[PDB]
Design a protein around this ligand. Structure first.
Ligand SMILES: *CC(=O)NCC1CCN(C(=O)C2(Oc3ccc(Cl)cc3)CCCC2)CC1
Ligand SMILES: *CC(=O)NCC1CCN(C(=O)C2(Oc3ccc(Cl)cc3)CCCC2)CC1
Ligand SMILES: [Mg+2]
Ligand SMILES: [Mg+2]
Ligand SMILES: [Mg+2]
Ligand SMILES: [Mg+2]
Ligand SMILES: [Mg+2]
Ligand SMILES: [Mg+2]
Lengths: 236, 5, 236, 5
């Protein structure tokens, strides 16, 4: 641990600074250090962890898609041979992306998930587990693609089961989980009907519970409901 | 890209 | 050299891919590898080098400014003591930025500048030398700030002298040099009158030469002329 | 930021 000599509170402070500076690689490293102190994370701290890695992997995924598209174009008929460089560089980015996913999955397995007893924390971490297996699935092409997909599905399903038992239908973690699991169904599992059903049922059950909410909670929940609607519009 | 959070 | 085993042409190909993927750290590393092959750079290759490092250092400078502002706020009256973390993290980013500047200056000194005999190449590299000393100057506060500023000034001045002798007043390298030297005067040297004079004289001498240009050259030159105008508007 | 290139 490069961060082993730094105070937990200092790591969290610096993660917040890194976020303000849009230094997401630094933010992720600080948050990894904080997790490795061994104490459970607060809600705010869980958010910092998720924001940091979402931004790092998001950039990698975008780069990977650019390179994969160039590669695919190079393998079409009439395309002039340009040697191994496009494949090599796509592989480089892919390997870095896989590394980040493995790091996050590692933190969740050692030992965030096992120590998370409250619904809000356990669902949050299981959603992350699904998400990072989904990112691995996006780039998987070999013997293990099926197992990676199943790992994502299993994590999302456990999260769904807990969220349905323990959280109201407007809870933003529950909504965001459903949003992402729906995307998993559409983009990864080749199950667009399941994706659409999940998004619709989630949206409608949330709609029915909005009346229970404060203005601020209403804002939070409706934001994510709109994302569900946006996907439905894209898919139908 | 469909939306995720 | 991490890039010592890779072909020069492969490094240039991958720099171009990295640019398309907005992977500017990778782009810079590829271009460093290409320079270290020891051959002179073509115009296209000089542009790749400049684009890569401009984007890397640009991000660092933006982050440094965010952190410096937070630090300055922390040192005002009535500000609650938050410990050494803001200073530590600003220092971390600063040190990384200084490292990138030193790397670029190193490439220019070993051996880009000495081997550049054509006006277009020599002016391009001397402009870069001025620019990277200017970035060092932005963060300098100690015994060496004056010497760093003088190093920037000297590089820009040599570039100016060559550009005036050897290039037309609409040449985009000559215009961009003047633009940046003008900014050096305003932001670094505390010489706003010099900055304004340089920008105005550069703009007016370019205007008078536009009639000699093709449509495409006209586009190139007028773009940078507008940047001169934008600065003049900001400063007057 | 004034403009530079
Ligand atoms: C500790 C905790 O409760 N974190 C979750 C909370 C949910 C709302 N937040 C958001 O930034 C937005 O929604 C989500 C929903 C789920 C997840 Cl996993 C992340 C973000 C982002 C889009 C609308 C609000 C803050 C974190
Ligand atoms: C090898 C070579 O001639 N490179 C210079 C050339 C100038 C125009 N280019 C640009 O991207 C823009 O202008 C400059 C001007 C000077 C410098 Cl050092 C960089 C860029 C950018 C704004 C308008 C055009 C391409 C590179
Ligand atoms: Mg301690
Ligand atoms: Mg691979
Ligand atoms: Mg169902
Ligand atoms: Mg060779
Ligand atoms: Mg320092
Ligand atoms: Mg003069």
């Amino acid at each position: 641990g490069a961060m082993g000599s730094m105070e937990r509170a200092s790591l969290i402070q610096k993660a917040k600074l890194a976020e303000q500076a849009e230094r997401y690689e630094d933010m992720a490293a600080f948050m990894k250090g904080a997790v490795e102190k061994g104490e459970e994370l607060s809600c705010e701290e869980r958010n910092l962890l998720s924001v940091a890695y979402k931004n790092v992997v998001g950039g990698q995924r975008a780069a990977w898609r650019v390179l994969s598209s160039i590669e695919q174009k190079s393998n079409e008929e009439g395309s002039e041979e340009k040697g191994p460089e496009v494949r090599e560089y796509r592989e480089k980015v892919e390997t870095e992306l896989q590394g980040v996913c493995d790091t996050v999955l590692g933190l969740l397995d050692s030992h965030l998930i096992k120590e998370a007893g409250d619904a809000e924390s356990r669902v949050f971490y299981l959603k992350m587990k699904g998400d990072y297996y989904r990112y691995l699935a996006e780039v998987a092409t070999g013997d293990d693609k099926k197992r990676i997909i199943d790992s994502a599905r299993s994590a999302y399903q456990e999260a769904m089961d807990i969220s349905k038992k323990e959280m109201p239908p407007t809870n933003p973690i529950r909504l965001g989980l459903a949003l992402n699991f729906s995307v998993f169904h559409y983009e990864i599992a080749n199950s667009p009907e399941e994706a659409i059903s999940l998004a619709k049922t989630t949206f409608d059950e949330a709609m029915a519970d909005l009346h229970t909410l404060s203005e601020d909670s209403y804002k939070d929940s409706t934001l994510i409901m709109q994302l569900l609607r946006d996907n439905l519009t894209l898919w139908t | 890209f469909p939306a995720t959070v």
